[PDB]
Structure 1
Amino acid sequence: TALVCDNGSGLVKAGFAGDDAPRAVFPSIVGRPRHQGVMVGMGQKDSYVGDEAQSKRGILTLKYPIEHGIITNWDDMEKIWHHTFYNELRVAPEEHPTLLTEAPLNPKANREKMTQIMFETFNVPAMYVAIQAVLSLYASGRTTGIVLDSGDGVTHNVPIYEGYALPHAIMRLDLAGRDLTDYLMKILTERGYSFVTTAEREIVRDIKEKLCYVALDFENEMATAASSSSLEKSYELPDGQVITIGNERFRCPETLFQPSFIGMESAGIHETTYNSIMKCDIDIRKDLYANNVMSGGTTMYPGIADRMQKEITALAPSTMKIKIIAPPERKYSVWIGGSILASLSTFQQMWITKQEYDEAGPSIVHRKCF
């Protein structure tokens, strides 16, 4: 059996090829103790990873090894991978092929060092690096469609027609969760709540995951919040305090469609998806307008599919039939596709083996993976 896909900026998703869901998710977090040490027994470890780092977040300084799809701390990433193989999957990596993921248009050193650690520090018999958008299509079961994958660090579009990707039409915005979260905590200050870095950021992330949603009509929704209290909702902080959030719970995800809210000049995800189309061949656009596949956690906002349906119906010819595919398992679509891909008998030839790596070095990953 083969260990399977994850490189998530916000969450890890580990498991076994052929399973229907990851066996362990836990956040991609490494926390270091601060302002403690007096008691002989109140923590002996110098770092906590994923789960049980969220539990101890109060006394820790949490930081993500992966920022906008790019891993920026390889000492901590190795800790997370070590935690994944030994403390979550309870397996020995040196006897399981491991399939990893990566956002498109990432720095190539990212893949090169990913394959170096896998083959050297973990001695995996074989590995592979896949593109998250491609895997989402595997999970959906399609061979045609444009997949809008947005997780915690990157939102990107990969149009695929008949298993053929159009690399010139790949779009990538460094605007996903962890930017909506940062905007939400900024937007909560005007309501009277501070939520200073690290530990409180996770609280803000939880309130975003629970209360935030995408308004079908932002201007109409804004008027409703101003003129009434029906949209107000309350959330209980871990210490028992209750915060009331009103229009802030649909302005936070609105930055996906109006990135200028957070000072970004790029267009919204609806226009980026439409821009990804119209860079493909004209004969392919009809099938791409349908099969608009959503994936990733950041696409889990209620009403995001309907808003994207509405937004892409605009910008496009009236005769085109826009269809947004948002399966309930969006959040694990990438992992499910990786499980499907890694389990195919025909895929077993595509593995990069330890034999190839030592012959060609880390660069092999470029001429063996998309």
Structure 2
Amino acid sequence: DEDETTALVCDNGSGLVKAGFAGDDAPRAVFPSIVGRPRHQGVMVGMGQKDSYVGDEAQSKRGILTLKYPIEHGIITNWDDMEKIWHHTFYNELRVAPEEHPTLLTEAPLNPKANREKMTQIMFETFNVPAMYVAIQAVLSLYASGRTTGIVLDSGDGVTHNVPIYEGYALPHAIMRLDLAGRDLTDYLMKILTERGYSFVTTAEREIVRDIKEKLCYVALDFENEMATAASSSSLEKSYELPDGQVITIGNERFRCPETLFQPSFIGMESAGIHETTYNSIMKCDIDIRKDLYANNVMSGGTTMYPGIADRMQKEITALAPSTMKIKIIAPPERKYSVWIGGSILASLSTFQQMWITKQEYDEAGPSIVHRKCF
């Protein structure tokens, strides 16, 4: 009797949770890590059988919830709403009881090892999973670009993490985080639109500005060229309809928005820009491998879906790096799910009980099992 247990694949992500089945190469749900518990203010119309409104449920229920974020930076900032992420994902979105069905979870860059223990715990205590694994997000994103050594990133609405890697093993000295993110780019896009005189004030208006960010914004090859071209050709500004035929136009904002990720002073951030942070991340690594890092710059993450960003990164890295260095930036056909797609392939790669922890190995070794196994 030969059939295989189609495992569950939850990327816990950079505060954007991504859920599906293993070997199926599309998600089944994907939502921002928001859990809303109720306010007494407004009207609350509780017609489900829980108080915690998770992801989509909070996005459809403005003003009347107090929101709390169980993951923000890829670290789990809270546990008691984070259960309710997984709980809703299994029993409402994926539509299964985990009792027979193995689960791949993901660990993000810089996460403590006690957060593996309580993840290994909760999957065997609260969700009854027969066997589980904790994959490291950056290595899945690197392996989706088909490299074993190189530098990789995620860049989302949470944070941007840079991770240099040698042979699947991440180099911890040189991992860097830039906390200027796609959040601040969305709310900066909303700023420059209200400066142009267009109203956006609710979260239901803000997530239409977040739509405009995804579908209409891009990185310029350099700013002043694009600005001079947009000024001398006002015809390059482009229209957008809202979901009820009310029309806007946006142009010079479409690059002037993403540009502040290469220019921290335009938004009032101390830090290095992504180019500086990437070069600093490579430069805090060992002197031999730096040239294979320069030649394996894998762009991945939600915000890296912008046009022009790989083109601009090749330009910025050749301004920072010595001219004897052969730079090769890579930016694959899909970038916001590269973690989860690598996870779905890895969670459908059957055979050899090395990485995946079966229930019996927790019932022998306790929570410490994950540090014998997830090398």
Query: Does the alignment reach a TM-score above 0.5?
Result: yes
Contact 2:237–2:251 (Cα < 8 Å) also in 1: yes
Closer, same or farther in 2 for the Cα pair 1:165/1:9, shift >3 Å? closer
Shift of 1:66: 2.5
Cα deviation per residue 1:238-285 (whole Å; 9 max; x = unaligned)?
454323223222122112212233222111111211111122222212
Q: Which moved more, 1:179-188 or 1:344-353?
A: 344-353
Contact 1:58/1:199 (8 A) holds in 2: no
**Which residue does 1:161 correspond to in 2?**
166
Q: Please say if 1:209 is aligned against 2:209.
A: no
Aligned counterparts of 2:64 and 2:188: Cα–Cα separation in 1: 24
Structure 1 residue 361, shift from structure 2 partner = 5.0
> Does the C-alpha gap of structure 1 residues 368 and 265 become closer, same or farther in structure 2, counting only changes over 3 Å?
farther
Q: CA RMSD in A?
A: 3.0
Q: Helix, strand or coil: the match of 2:337?
A: helix
User: Take 1:344 and 1:138, find their aligned partners in 2: how far apart are those partners?
Assistant: 14
Give the direction of change, closer, same or farther, for the CA distance of 1:142–1:44 in structure 2 (3 Å limit): closer
Q: 1:214: how far off?
A: 0.5
| Structure 1 pair 257–236 and aligned structure 2 pair: CA distance change class (3 A) | same
After superposition, give the CA deviation of every residue in 1:63-91 in whole Å (9 maximum; x if it has no partner): 64432323444343322212211222222
Q: Is the alpha carbon distance of 1:346 and 1:61 closer, same or farther for their aligned partners in structure 2, counting shifts above 3 Å?
A: same
Distance 1:133 1:40, change over 3 A: closer
Compared with structure 1, are the counterparts of its residues 23 and 117 closer, same or farther at alpha carbon in structure 2 (3 Å cutoff)?
same
Distance 1:206 1:90 in 2: 28
Q: CA deviation at 1:311?
A: 1.0
Instruction: Give the gaps of 5 or more residues in structure 2.
Output: 1-5
8 Å CA contact 2:7–2:347 kept in 1: the answer is yes
Give 1:360 shift: 5.4
CA distance 1:307–1:114, shift in 2 (3 Å): same
Partner of 1:183: 188
Aligned length: 370
Contact 1:103 1:154 in 2 (8 A): no
In the aligned structure 2, how far is the partner of 1:282 from the partner of 1:40?
61
Instruction: Name whichever of 151-160 and 16-25 sits farther off.
Output: 16-25
Measure, in 1, the Cα distance between the counterparts of 2:150 and 2:220.
25
* Cα pair 1:29 1:49 within 8 Å, conserved: yes
Q: Deviations over 1:103-141 (max 9, x none)?
A: 211355544443332222112223232221111122222
Alignment deviations for residues 211-256 of structure 1 (CA, whole Å, 9 cap, x no partner): 1110111122223334441332222234543232232221221122
Q: How far apart, CA to CA, are the structure 1 residues paired with 2:97 and 2:33? A: 20
Q: Paired residue for 2:67, among 39, 62, 66?
A: 62
CA separation in 1, counterparts of 2:59 and 2:122? 26
Structure 1 residues 18 and 195, CA, compared in 2 at 3 Å: closer, same or farther? Answer: same
**Residue 202 of structure 2 aligns to a residue in which SS?**
coil
More moved, 78-87 vs 326-335: 78-87
2:212 aligns to what SS in structure 1? helix
Contact kept? 2:13, 2:108, Cα under 8 Å = no
Indicate if the aligned counterparts of 2:15 and 2:74 stay in contact, CA closer than 8 A: no
Quote the Cα distance in structure 2 between the aligned partners of 1:211 and 1:322: 29
Match of 1:5, SS state, is strand
Structure 1 spans left out of the alignment, 5+ residues: none
Bigger mean CA deviation after superposition, 66-75 or 248-257: 66-75
Name the stretch that deviates more: 330-339 or 57-66. Answer: 57-66
On the 8 A contact 2:15/2:73 being kept in 1, the answer is no
Per the TM alignment, residue 335 of structure 1 is displaced from its structure 2 partner at its CA by 0.6
User: Residues 126 and 298 (structure 1 numbering): CA distance in 2 closer, same or farther, change over 3 Å?
Assistant: same
Between 1:122-131 and 1:35-44, the stretch displaced more is: 35-44
Relative distance call for 1:163 and 1:52 in structure 2 (3 A) is closer
Distance 2:178 2:350 in 1: 34
What is the SS of the residue equivalent to 1:172? strand
Residue in structure 2 matching 1:363, options 365, 368, 371: 368
Contact 1:62 1:198 in 2 (8 A): no
Aligned residues with identical type, % of pairs: 100
Distance 2:71 2:106 in 1: 13
Where 1:149 maps in the other structure, the secondary structure is strand
**Equivalent of 1:78 in 69, 80, 83:** 83
Contact 1:5–1:334 (8 Å) recurs in 2: no
